[PDB]
């Protein structure tokens, strides 16, 4: 049995009680607790839980301010060591050197792990949640002063390290692959002739690849700070969730572009060619595990303007109808099949972010911030663990990069796509629907004929990659 | 038994998710997990008739505006929600109704107008303005306070009645 | 899918972190930041089966025997790493094996002996000496380079296969 400092000179030694900490019914899992108890466990001396550190650092701002968090971990770090024991006093009083058995044990089993864990929190804080520091300069000065006060040849390794990470973070990612990326594919449009780039002139395989690289980069850029507290749904969403919104807006624009390409091709035969090309792009998206790409296509095919084009879908080959149907099925029954498929593939992949947003929002609106026990308001940590489980799954899929070569011009083409032009949403959306009524009138109005608009061959080069280089 | 597919639509931040949660979840359990299977279905008894409610709430995904048509086509009845302290969300209702009519290709779709009280900020849409809008559309108006659970059952049950009487 | 808890151990500076980050992000970390304790997650298909890897990257030879034991309790498999250009790190291996055997109280805990930094020409530990040690423990020996990525997947995935057949 090891003695702890007096709860009178060190606040993190109060014993655990149903009034300051609650556990979830293999390390313990915290359901709720006071901020002091949460910090104690965040830096517990008995076991490790890097998972706790990420959860806490990702979600603490709703129950503790940055400045207060720093003050508390500094207090946690400053552990008073015990007084010599009776055996030591005897030795000291005889003029001998004390064995200090308990002092040495206390340092090895309590002080060292607690202080190392506090420093670990500081390191992860600065390395992965540096925005707290970018937004508050005094907080950073306090951190630097603290790390700079840490004495001892032992802690030296970590002090120097954290100091360097901090400096690196203030003044401002190579990739190695198992294999070599496949060769870029070209169809009608040739390299350098960006003016000719379009849905049917670029190779469908390369369209899916370049959009996958683009969508992957957008997905990988979303930080947890843009999600916690449901900030993307609030009035300052543009300020707090810029990367998320940019990712969603690209997806929306691409869906609208697919719809536009379809309804503006008035000639039935050419429209059938346009729809088939888009389904081939979906097929490559599936091969690449770009789920965001797959749903962009499904969303377009199920939009009001396109969904009603019976004469067009009637001419689509069965193998393609099947492909579209199976893609559509991923979202049915609340994405049941999509969730099963995502959990089974081999990354890299580009997940559909929508699911995550809804789950985070509901977790936050359906759980209380605090649980009350005997008049005490304990932080509801299980709520935070649930949100961090979601941000954690998002981060896991953000790690693996795609082994595909970027083609600058094609990438530029898609970055600048603007189907809506200068029109407002409602007007553009009404335009697409009116175009749909024009090209395929409601029954019993007869189907009119329209002149061709494409002067180049409409035959698709297919979706199987070629291999010459 | 009959299953009713209900879709909750409206501007972001009006409390659509809280309504769904309040209707579905167990209000007598410490923790709620929306990632759990079928946390969107609830068996209920309405006017002595037992049925299964399947609720699609896309709160949080409002920015994916091009996915709206697809999400809406899955429903038989719709809850059109606005926040009583947010006039813009009230003014958006008209377009949501028109879009629902378009994707269901019918001028007579089962729906209920729902005004939700999200917090204690000042109300900007009065009961009469909303009642008049609902009357002009020929649909019921229900006011809720998802936070206190008032009117939640009423909003969904009223919608189911609209579906049964279509 | 099955979850596997892997733990990477070995003397400080051998490449535990670089190996893990290369596996996780396909990125080579050139700077040296001593580790205290970090965790990573990786979904990957191995032998046609989808796995969820939990990788615990520990701090090495930092003379914190107390904490180390803490990491080994949870792990299902261990990657015991040394650098082929550092004899002392090779000599530290048996200490880790003994500790693991002790902590988990078992003579056949799944593990892989990893000789890292095989991209460097100044080798001081011969493959034969390491292979003999691996045979004495009844485990595979795999040489790797977190820099070039050589043998990295092989090391981690072989460990997964051992945990799976155990
Ligand atoms: N040339 C080469 N250098 C490597 C290789 N692996 C790691 N290094 C270098 O070795 C140094 C220490 O690598 P780390 O991965 O931090 O070592 P570690 O085992 O995690 O150290 P602790 O966390 O202190 O226990 C770094 O400067 C890396 O860049 C490798 O395969 N080849
Ligand atoms: Mg390390």
Coordinates of C-alpha atoms and ligand atoms in Angstrom, one line a residue, chain A residues 158, chain C residues 10-19 28-36 57-62 116-120 144-148, ligand 1:
Chain A
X158 CA 10.9 15.6 -23.0
Chain C
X10 CA 12.4 -1.7 -27.8
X11 CA 15.3 0.6 -26.9
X12 CA 14.8 4.4 -27.5
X13 CA 15.8 5.5 -30.9
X14 CA 15.5 2.2 -32.8
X15 CA 12.5 3.3 -34.9
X16 CA 9.4 2.2 -33.1
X17 CA 7.5 5.4 -34.0
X18 CA 8.9 5.8 -37.5
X19 CA 7.8 2.2 -38.3
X28 CA 8.8 8.7 -42.9
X29 CA 9.5 10.8 -39.8
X30 CA 13.1 12.1 -40.0
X31 CA 13.2 14.1 -36.8
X32 CA 13.5 12.4 -33.4
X33 CA 10.8 13.0 -30.8
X34 CA 11.1 10.6 -27.9
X35 CA 7.8 8.8 -27.2
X36 CA 6.0 8.7 -23.9
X57 CA 3.7 2.8 -29.6
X58 CA 5.7 2.9 -26.3
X59 CA 8.7 4.9 -25.2
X60 CA 11.9 2.9 -25.0
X61 CA 14.9 2.3 -22.7
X62 CA 13.8 5.4 -20.9
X116 CA 15.1 -1.9 -38.2
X117 CA 17.1 0.6 -40.2
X118 CA 18.2 -2.0 -42.8
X119 CA 18.6 0.9 -45.3
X120 CA 21.8 1.9 -43.5
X144 CA 12.8 -3.4 -41.9
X145 CA 13.3 0.2 -42.9
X146 CA 10.8 2.8 -41.8
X147 CA 12.5 5.1 -44.3
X148 CA 12.2 3.0 -47.5
Ligands
LIG1 N1 17.9 5.5 -41.8 C1 16.7 5.1 -41.0 N2 16.6 6.0 -40.0 C2 15.5 5.5 -39.3 C3 14.8 4.5 -39.5 N3 13.8 4.4 -38.5 C4 13.8 5.4 -37.6 N4 14.9 6.1 -38.1 C5 15.5 7.4 -37.5 O1 15.8 7.1 -36.2 C6 15.4 8.2 -35.2 C7 14.6 7.7 -33.9 O2 13.5 7.0 -34.7 P1 12.1 6.9 -33.7 O3 11.1 6.2 -34.5 O4 11.7 8.2 -33.0 O5 12.6 6.0 -32.5 P2 11.9 5.3 -31.3 O6 12.3 3.9 -31.2 O7 10.4 5.6 -31.4 O8 12.4 6.1 -29.9 P3 11.7 6.4 -28.4 O9 10.2 6.8 -28.6 O10 12.5 7.4 -27.7 O11 11.7 5.1 -27.6 C8 14.8 9.2 -36.1 O12 15.7 10.2 -36.3 C9 14.2 8.5 -37.3 O13 14.1 9.3 -38.4 C10 14.9 3.6 -40.5 O14 14.4 2.6 -40.9 N5 16.1 4.0 -41.4

